[PDB]
Amino acid sequence: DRLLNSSDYTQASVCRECGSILTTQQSVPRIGSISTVCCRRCSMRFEDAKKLIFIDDSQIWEDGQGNKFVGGNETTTVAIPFVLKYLDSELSAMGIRLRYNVEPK
Amino acid sequence: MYKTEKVDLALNRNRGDPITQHFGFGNDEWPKEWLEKLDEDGLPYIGTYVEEGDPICAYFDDTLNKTKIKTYHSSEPAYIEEVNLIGDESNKFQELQTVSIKYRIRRTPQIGDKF
Amino acid sequence: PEDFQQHEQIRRKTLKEKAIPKDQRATTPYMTKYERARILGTRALQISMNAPVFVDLEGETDPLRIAMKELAEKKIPLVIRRYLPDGSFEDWSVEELIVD
Amino acid sequence: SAAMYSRFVKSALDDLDKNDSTQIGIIANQVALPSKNPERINDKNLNILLDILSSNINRIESSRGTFLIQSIINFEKWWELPPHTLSKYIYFIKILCSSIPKWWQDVSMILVSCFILPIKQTVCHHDMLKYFLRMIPSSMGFIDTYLAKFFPNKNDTRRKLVNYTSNLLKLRGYCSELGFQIWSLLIEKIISIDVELQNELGIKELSTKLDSILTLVSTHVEEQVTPESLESGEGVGVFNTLTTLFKTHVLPTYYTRSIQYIMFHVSQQQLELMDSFLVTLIDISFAVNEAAEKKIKSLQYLGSYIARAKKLSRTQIIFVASYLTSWLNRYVIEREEEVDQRGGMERFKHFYAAFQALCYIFCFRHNIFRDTDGNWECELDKFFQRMVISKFNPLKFCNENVMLMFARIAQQESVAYCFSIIENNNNERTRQQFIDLQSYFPYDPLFLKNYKILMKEYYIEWS
Amino acid sequence: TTCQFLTKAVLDNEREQLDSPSARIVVGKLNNVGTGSFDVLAKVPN
Amino acid sequence: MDISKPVGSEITSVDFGILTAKEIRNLSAKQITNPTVLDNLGHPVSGGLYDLALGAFLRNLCSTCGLDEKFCPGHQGHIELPVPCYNPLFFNQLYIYLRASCLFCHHFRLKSVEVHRYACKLRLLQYGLIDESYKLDEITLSSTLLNELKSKRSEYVDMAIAKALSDGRTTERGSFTATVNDERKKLVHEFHKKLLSRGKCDNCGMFSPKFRKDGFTKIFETALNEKQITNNRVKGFIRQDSTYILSTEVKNILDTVFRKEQCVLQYVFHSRPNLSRKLVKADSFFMDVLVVPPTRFRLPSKLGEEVHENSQNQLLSKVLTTSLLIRDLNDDLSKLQKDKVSLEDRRVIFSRLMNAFVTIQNDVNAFIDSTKAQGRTSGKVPIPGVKQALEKKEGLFRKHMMGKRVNYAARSVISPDPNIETNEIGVPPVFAVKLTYPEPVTAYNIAELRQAVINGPDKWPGATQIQNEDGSLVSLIGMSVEQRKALANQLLTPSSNVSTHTLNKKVYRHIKNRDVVLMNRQPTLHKASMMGHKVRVLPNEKTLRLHYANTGAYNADFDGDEMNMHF
Amino acid sequence: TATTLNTPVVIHATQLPQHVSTDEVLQFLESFIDEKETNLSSSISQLKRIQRDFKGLP
Amino acid sequence: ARFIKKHKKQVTNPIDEKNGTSNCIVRVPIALYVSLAPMYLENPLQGVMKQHLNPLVMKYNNKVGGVVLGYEGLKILDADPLSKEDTSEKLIKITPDTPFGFTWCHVNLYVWQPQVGDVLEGYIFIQSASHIGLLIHDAFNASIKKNNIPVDWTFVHGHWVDSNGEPIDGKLRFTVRNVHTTGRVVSVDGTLI
Ligand SMILES: [Zn+2]
Ligand SMILES: [Zn+2]
Ligand SMILES: [Zn+2]
């Protein structure tokens, strides 16, 4: 209640694939389409992916700048204390990576 | 209990600078409920009851072309006791920039008071 | 896709190789003070969201009190899964545990 | 001009295959302008732009083409265009949603929102909805949510509300299936009006609002459910759906009259409408499960209904009530001793509730319960007395105004006595919610102008 | 010293199994000892 | 935390590791290159530290996700370091391996056979096989014998792990208890001691020049001693078939040693079996890029009315200037023909380059470890680096994770009361009216909650708001009695939406005698200084009232001591 | 939109998809339509139209 | 040495006889981990159906790689691994934080999984100079763009005309160029060359 619930407790996105909570973002969709949750680490720049079979439409997403990506759709939400995000952020400044193993896979 | 607060709108100005803010009201459109607490000079009428959020001061800001308002901050309501105009030396010419407002707070003895 | 199936089958197989049999249970036949509290709270939670209730309310408006009543008559459809420290477990029905 | 513009666009499209995208955008921006700005692309040039785009829509199905398309879907007051030009706009939209059925979502939303407009200004919108619902049945999903999204709020302008229902009715008439979301919207909105009217009991506003809405609904129902339509039609289906929805929303929620009448009134159009709906209420009444409050609310509904209706058989009603009363003999038998047993008379709220309703029904339809002989249907003379002297002592636990009126009337009819039982009662003399629940009668008289007149054929005023 | 031990964990490529009270508070996981000593399952008919 | 927003996914373990410069570049939302943070109109400078790709900032929207300052989680970017730097966190370990290396044959100077004996032992310990690791030492039956020894030790380790897996002693995930961890740590210590204890290389017989350090992460290489240069050329025929030394030289040396000595390193750097099969790379001790944390985590502060820059930005901009300056040194470098340039200008250009590298490396060091930075402009007092942020006072962990600020809880002076129950607490209405407990609305409580909503925020027992099925809240604050009566009549309406059909509304009702709170007096030295009391709301009271029977537990004196009430 | 209340946390095929004859598609449509007789109603209505087309009709 | 190539269509597909089209209807068994709301504790199968399965009907689903037509043989996997697959009393583990259950289920999905290259037949419902609009199985949208129609085909005011001067009508046979799936409803891009 008191060190989580009646305090912070705010769902966050993880990539089930790389186990990060820092490399997810909302996609920016074309008008009419719905936004989805994607991992910047696990996805290819669109060009580079073409340069190596056909690529399905649901597998492409875009950011605000406009770059297109392929993949990185293995995300969910987990309940974590917010301060965890801060710690993970500081650690990555120091070159350190936390990798959360999430279930179900 | 008595508390004295000093309102000094020369706090920002960089030393003998042009004066941006003057006590009083501007001619733009401002609340009007303000005159319940404040006299024409932008200072509060003596005796006024004042609770958290009320105006205790009104000045016109030049850089904003608006009339602004220092508000009362204690969660305990009070009455205005003395309002002192602290003029400046260095020979007159200077207009009002510093004021002291003394609040009076009632203390009826309560549960939890020590004797 | 073919191999997630395999992964699941392995998970489910091992999970069935740990759970101890009922006729092979070895922990206390008494409900623990912890088990009781959680059983009450959780059943109360389900009552607050329109779980079918197995007893007469008789004017009660506190879902915790309703749970307590259900507990008293042994009509709480919950099961406690007790974990031994190696992760294997014993399932005990709320009705079968001696309550005090 | 005429042919110069044909070039301008034809160039623009070439320029688009090259990705320059400037020429198009210049055009798009020109069509996107407001209905007011004189500088918005004129009809003749628009005729051209449109017919050229329609002729090879695939030239545009690109990221570069998006903005142009968006600008034409968002063309202000297109329904206000000209015939010939209107036709080219329609053909374009038709063509567009065919290949990339992705814009139909955007087009229909705007269409539905135009339902606030008169019975005429929407024809084109419905024509289009009917068309594409048929060819793209999968769309019904998101377009249903549109029905939700764009409903006007109760606060919003009356013309908005009255329009958005006028359109929904029009929609109903070419997309029979979608039905549910619509009916959910109307119901959800009417409950808002009824609830608010009660609580409040500006107000002059809600009156004429809620008045304009109900009078509409009921006249459409007077038409739409019809004997012809009941044997071979969707009037019967509509009736069933409506009844279920109505009961459920009405079945539940607490203390307000202004919508439940819709059922009071449609009911009494035809004998069977009365029958089946009434049997549904009977099914409600005596289910074992139902909230001590649901069974009591239904019983109030039941009693109020029988009393007030007009398109009744005397006899389909009375016999069922008599059976319920025999239902009564069982209740007391399987419970007084449950009476002399541990507990209070509150254990039997539900009994009194139903007995009230039946007594109340007898007050208003008394003069009816005497058959040709001058004998009483259901042996009411012998029956009432038995309950009155029972151990439940109904007279003590039921209402304070019905029990009185029943006394008066029953005594007058030599049916049952009671002034001494009352004397004895006030000599011997969560509880509030119950008194509250027993005071509300969902079919006590209505307020308001037209509906009243319409109900007259179906209503018995106290007079 | 946080950074020293962190340093040790990284160089071991350690996995935090999340069993200690401290670790679970860090990640927001329900505590083990006490309540976290049994599972609840629902008996479902049909 | 909301009981109607359940979470399906669950974190079950955390793995520690190192970000590679490849990962970072790929995930990055923007490469940051401008030291300057704002322009004359207070907008983020593009490519600067507040660049909008790193997240919404003030009234601007995030350029990466499009969300505003409230819903935008922030995104990381990166700085490109023009020259490799030692990661200050792992500088001591780098030092150990560097010193242990043979700069000639590129193995560790410790004899291969011994190193293999450690690899065998550590590998066994990954599976918790402590007895076996001692038995490994029991193995004996010049370079021909040794490879058979190595080989038979190797076949023992395999046979032991195989046997251990077949019975119930291990999994492929290993076995890791305290006794195992103790044996492991000893061995690694013993191994490192033996690494640094060798002079001449046991494997090729050469001498490598000795390496020396700073406390500021600089590495010096001491050239060879006389006897040692003599010894080295004697071995010259067999091989035929002080100064600052740049971080790039060091990395090349370790890169090769890590390839050759990969086997042992595979177990020195993994306490569990390395299922992932990733190589152990020297790069892990270095870094070419820096991760710029999201913007939301790099905002200015206001000290009353005056606004102060963010200290982490002050440090990052120093990295930025040095960076531009080195990119210029690098431009003049090859921008001047050698023919015209001089062994005379060659020396000076190098002098300037060394200077730049050293001071940027110092500014980086000072961050993740200010205690490694050169004290600035003698005065000012240092600006905290990341280490100091995590370790300020009791430190982030203790001050904001093991303990936190709470909410809803109240505090008051306590007063005695003999007229409440020994298990109650007398709650002043001033609290009772502000506390919230959610109520879900049901058939069994619709009467009660109707009344609460009608009563409103200010008449007890009332309510302050309603949660709708779509999660939205409606305030009862500004409302008239009629508006409230209306909302009270729609508390239990059916669902007009399939997605929320499983939910019911919630009424945020005022305190109630039915309720339980948690009372606390500090210091809390045993559990009875934090107990549950039944609530009893008392009109006209301004303090918490507590029966005497509880003083013992709380160690309470009624001398103006205060308690906390948690709801 | 999608929550844990209306959307599976994860879905996995356990086998390779097996192709089905027309006679099977028809037997399945038959029973699935019958068993499911507001959103679901208007949907089986549409499925009913598709099974009609499979059989060649209007 | 690296396998992102585990997004490769592992559901091949052929054509037909006595016919010429492809058969894209397929039956795939799945496992799915789903929530069970407390209101359904007495009707768990009903609840899994109304919460999770029903919303999948006639929508594209990324995992089966097609449109889900429907489902058969739903089964809950008892959290009690000791019970017989028979019994109608089963265990569903309850979330620590919430009253919701989560169980695994097995069910069978019927999926329309068309893929580029396939040969389909459509019922013509619209003809502009820009595209031909068809309806496959009287349910799913198709569209042949103006320049996927062979060059000698002509148009009039309207309606198309073929290589030999005779108008086309009703059933038309085309090959799949691309399948657009992200819009409100699925739409097929078809070609005639
Ligand atoms: Zn990832
Ligand atoms: Zn963002
Ligand atoms: Zn060597």
UniProtKB/Swiss-Prot annotation, chain C:
Top-level division of the source organism's lineage: Eukaryota
Answer whether the UniProt record assigns the keyword Transmembrane to this protein. no
GO molecular function terms attached to this record: DNA binding; DNA-directed RNA polymerase activity
Q: Where is this region: Leucine-zipper?
A: 57-78
Q: Record's GO cellular component, any one?
A: nucleus
Q: Which residues form a coiled coil?
A: none
Provide the alphabetized UniProt keywords: Cytoplasm, DNA-directed RNA polymerase, Nucleus, Phosphoprotein, Ribosome biogenesis, Transcription
The alphabetized list of GO BP terms reads: nucleolar large rRNA transcription by RNA polymerase I; ribosome biogenesis; RNA-templated transcription; termination of RNA polymerase I transcription; termination of RNA polymerase III transcription; transcription by RNA polymerase I; transcription by RNA polymerase II; transcription by RNA polymerase III
Is Nucleus tagged as a keyword? yes
Cell location: Cytoplasm; Nucleus
Other remarks on record? Answer: Present with 6090 molecules/cell in log phase SD medium.
Q: What does this protein do?
A: DNA-dependent RNA polymerases catalyze the transcription of DNA into RNA using the four ribonucleoside triphosphates as substrates. Common component of RNA polymerases I, II and III which synthesize ribosomal RNA precursors, mRNA precursors and many functional non-coding RNAs, and small RNAs, such as 5S rRNA and tRNAs, respectively. Pol II is the central component of the basal RNA polymerase II transcription machinery. RNA polymerases are composed of mobile elements that move relative to each other.
Which family is this sequence assigned to? Belongs to the archaeal Rpo6/eukaryotic RPB6 RNA polymerase subunit family.
- This protein is called what? DNA-directed RNA polymerases I, II, and III subunit RPABC2
Q: Which gene encodes it?
A: RPO26
In terms of the whole protein, what range is present? 55 to 154 of 155
Swiss-Prot record, chain D:
User: Which InterPro entries does the record match to this protein?
Assistant: RNA_pol_I_trans_ini_fac_RRN3 (IPR007991)
GO CC annotation: what is one? nucleolus
**A Pfam family it matches:** RRN3
Keyword Transit peptide among UniProt keywords: no
Subcellular location(s) of the protein: Nucleus
Gene Ontology BP annotations: transcription initiation at RNA polymerase I promoter
Judging by the UniProt lineage, the source's domain of life is Eukaryota
Which UniProt key words apply to this protein?
A: Nucleus, Transcription, Transcription regulation
Q: Mark the transmembrane ranges.
A: none
One GO MF term on file is:
RNA polymerase I general transcription initiation factor activity
Q: What extra comment accompanies this record? A: Present with 138 molecules/cell in log phase SD medium.
Give the family from UniProt: Belongs to the RRN3 family.
As for what it does, the entry says: Required for efficient transcription initiation by RNA polymerase I. Interacts with Pol I in the absence of template DNA and stimulates recruitment of Pol I, but does not remain as part of stable preinitiation complex.
How is this protein organized at the quaternary level? Monomer. Interacts with NOP53.
Name of protein: RNA polymerase I-specific transcription initiation factor RRN3
- Specify the species: Saccharomyces cerevisiae (strain ATCC 204508 / S288c)
Gene of this entry = RRN3
Curated annotation (Swiss-Prot), chain F:
Q: Which domain of life is it from?
A: Eukaryota
Q: Where does Zn(2+) 1 bind?
A: C62, C65, C72, H75
The SS bond pairs are none
Subcellular location per the Swiss-Prot or TrEMBL entry? Nucleus, Nucleolus
Q: Which positions bind Mg(2+)?
A: D557, D559, D561
Q: Which residues bind Zn(2+) 2?
A: C102, C105, C201, C204
Biological role:
DNA-dependent RNA polymerases catalyze the transcription of DNA into RNA using the four ribonucleoside triphosphates as substrates. Component of RNA polymerase I (Pol I) which synthesizes ribosomal RNA precursors. Besides, RNA polymerase I has intrinsic RNA cleavage activity. RPA190 and RPA135 both contribute to the polymerase catalytic activity and together form the Pol I active center. In addition, subunit RPA12 contributes a catalytic zinc ribbon that is required for RNA cleavage by Pol I.
Add the further remark from the entry. Present with 2840 molecules/cell in log phase SD medium.
The family this protein is said to belong to: Belongs to the RNA polymerase beta' chain family.
Subunit structure, interactors included: Component of the RNA polymerase I (Pol I) complex consisting of 14 subunits: RPA135, RPA190, RPC40, RPA14, RPB5, RPO26, RPA43, RPB8, RPA12, RPB10, RPC19, RPC10, RPA49 and RPA34. The complex is composed of a horseshoe-shaped core containing ten subunits (RPA135, RPA190, RPB5, RPO26, RPB8, RPB10, RPC10, RPA12, RPC19 and RPC40) where RPA135 and RPA190 form the DNA-binding cleft. Outside of the core, RPA14 and RPA43 form the stalk that mediates interactions with transcription initiation factors and newly synthesized RNA.
Swiss-Prot record, chain H:
Q: Which one of the record's GO molecular function terms can you name? A: DNA-directed RNA polymerase activity
Highest taxon, organism lineage: Eukaryota
Family affiliation: Belongs to the eukaryotic RPA43 RNA polymerase subunit family.
Q: What does this protein do?
A: DNA-dependent RNA polymerases catalyze the transcription of DNA into RNA using the four ribonucleoside triphosphates as substrates. Component of RNA polymerase I (Pol I) which synthesizes ribosomal RNA precursors. Besides, RNA polymerase I has intrinsic RNA cleavage activity. Through its association with RRN3 is involved in recruitment of Pol I to rDNA promoters. In vitro, the A13-A43 subcomplex binds single-stranded RNA.
Q: How is it modified after translation?
A: Contains an average of four phosphates per molecule.
For this UniProt record, the keywords arranged alphabetically read as follows: DNA-directed RNA polymerase, Nucleus, Phosphoprotein, Ribosome biogenesis, Transcription
Could you tell me where this protein is found in the cell?
Nucleus, Nucleolus
Q: In which broad location class does this protein mainly occur, judging by the first location in its UniProt entry? A: nucleus
Which organism is this entry from? Answer: Saccharomyces cerevisiae (strain ATCC 204508 / S288c) (Baker's yeast)
Q: Kindly provide the name given to this protein in its UniProt entry.
A: DNA-directed RNA polymerase I subunit RPA43
Q: Which GO terms describe its cellular component?
A: nucleus; RNA polymerase I complex
Q: Which residues carry this modification: Phosphoserine?
A: S187
Miscellaneous notes: Present with 4070 molecules/cell in log phase SD medium.
Which GO annotations describe the biological process of this protein? Answer: nucleolar large rRNA transcription by RNA polymerase I; ribosome biogenesis; termination of RNA polymerase I transcription; transcription by RNA polymerase I; transcription elongation by RNA polymerase I; transcription initiation at RNA polymerase I promoter
